[PDB]
Amino acid sequence: IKQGIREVILCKDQDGKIGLRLKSIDNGIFVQLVQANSPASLVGLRFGDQVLQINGENCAGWSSDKAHKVLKQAFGEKITMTIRDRPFERTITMHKDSTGHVGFIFKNGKITSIVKDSSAARNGLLTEHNICEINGQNVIGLKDSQIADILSTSGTVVTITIMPAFIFEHIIKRMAPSIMKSLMDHTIPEV
C-alpha cells in the first residue's frame, strides 16, 4: 500500500477497451474490477485503487455511470489517471508455523476467527475483513479451496492485503459472483 499518489498512462486495446469497472464510494471513484490481459492490468491498476483524476479532471462526486461515460469518450491514444494506492486496504506480514499454518479461518474470502498463539494473533489480523490479495496476487472471486492452495504453496513469509467487509460488500454490490471469478485479473504481473 504505497502511501502515495501516482500517474498511470493507459492505452485502449484493439477493441477500444481498457478493462476496468469503476464504483462510486463516499464521493470518490474506486476500482471494482480489473480485466486480465487488459491495458488496466499491464499499467498495474489494482482492485480498491482510487481514481483522483482522469485526464486531469477531478473524479469527486462522479456517479459510476459518469466515470464509465468519461472513459468511453477519451481520445483513446493516451488516458492519464491519478491513482491513490488501495486506500481502504492494509497489508499484514505473517510466517507459517512448523505445520504450515499462519493461524486463521476464513469463509467466502472473509476472515472469521484468529487462532490463539498464532502469527495471525501476534500480527493483529482482524476478523470481518475480506482477503483482497496474497503476496500481491488478487484472489477476489476465487473459491475458498483455491485461496487455501495459494496459502499452502506460498513460502513461509505470507503477505495478505485485507479490507473491512462493510467496504468490500459496498464496492462489489451490483456485480454477479460469477463475473468476479470469471474476469477479475488473478495473475502475477508481467515485467
DSSP of 111-123: EEEE-TTSHHHHT
Exposure b/e, 119-154, CB count within 10 A at least 16 = b: bbeeeebeeebbbbbbeebbbbbbeeeebeebbeeb
- CB-based contacts of 145, cutoff 8 Å, min separation 6: none
C-alpha span between 68 and 53 (Å, rounded): 13
Residue that is last in its domain, among 23, 58, 84: 84
As a whole number of Å, the end-to-end CA separation of the chain is 19
Q: Which of 61, 84, 107 is the last residue of a domain?
A: 84
What the block records as the C-alpha cell of 170 is 459496498
For residue 76, the surrounding DSSP H or E stretch is none
Choose one of 84, 112, 138: the last residue of a domain: 84
Pair (47, 69) in one structural domain:
yes
Residues 152 and 179 in one domain: yes
Do 178 and 96 lie in one domain? The reply is: yes
Q: Which of 31, 163, 25, 139 is nearest to 90 (CA)?
A: 163
Long-range contacts of 110-116 (CB under 8 A, 24+ apart): 110/165, 110/168, 111/162
Domain extent at residue 50: 5-84
Is 175 in a helix, a strand, or coil?
A: coil
**Quoted resolution (Å):** 2.1
The answer to whether the annotation marks 185 as part of a ligand binding site is: no
Q: Is 58 annotated as a binding residue?
A: no
Same domain, 74 and 56: yes
CATH number at residue 73: 2.30.42.10
Cell digits of residue 183? 474476469
Is 143 annotated as belonging to a binding site? yes
Contact 40, 18 (CB under 8 A): yes
Domain co-membership, 77 together with 37: yes
In 3D, which of 188, 139, 187, 146 has the Cα closest to residue 161? 139
